[PDB]
Amino acid sequence: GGLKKLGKKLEGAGKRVFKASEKALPVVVGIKAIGK
């Protein structure tokens, strides 16, 4: 089954990248927090 293949592949990135995003959450939110 490829389903679990795609859901497990991309997921791997979101786990490592979470550090790249989490760090800019204040920088990604500030826009969503200002522009709502």
From Swiss-Prot:
Q: Which GO terms describe its cellular component?
A: extracellular space
Listed GO biological process terms: antibacterial humoral response; defense response to Gram-negative bacterium; defense response to Gram-positive bacterium; innate immune response
Entry comment describing in which tissues the protein is expressed: Salivary gland (at protein level).
Q: Does this entry carry the keyword DNA repair?
A: no
Coiled-coil stretches noted in the UniProt entry, renumbered to this chain: none
Predominant cellular place of this UniProt entry's protein? secreted
Q: Which UniProt keywords apply?
A: Antibiotic, Antimicrobial, Immunity, Innate immunity, Secreted, Signal
Where does it localize?
A: Secreted
Q: What induces it?
A: Up-regulated in salivary glands after dengue virus infection at day 5, 9 and 14 (at protein level).
Outline what the protein does.
Antimicrobial peptide. Exhibits antibacterial activity against Gram-negative bacteria, such as Escherichia coli, Pseudomonas aeruginosa, Acinetobacter baumannii and Klebsiella pneumoniae. Shows no antibacterial effects against Gram-positive bacteria, such as Staphylococcus aureus, Enterococcus faecalis and Enterococcus faecium. Exhibits antiviral activity against all four dengue virus serotypes and chikungunya virus. Exhibits leishmanicidal activity. Partially neutralizes lipopolysaccharides (LPS).
Say which family it is in.
Answer: Belongs to the cecropin family.
Full protein name = Aedesin
What species is given as this protein's source?
A: Aedes aegypti (Yellowfever mosquito)
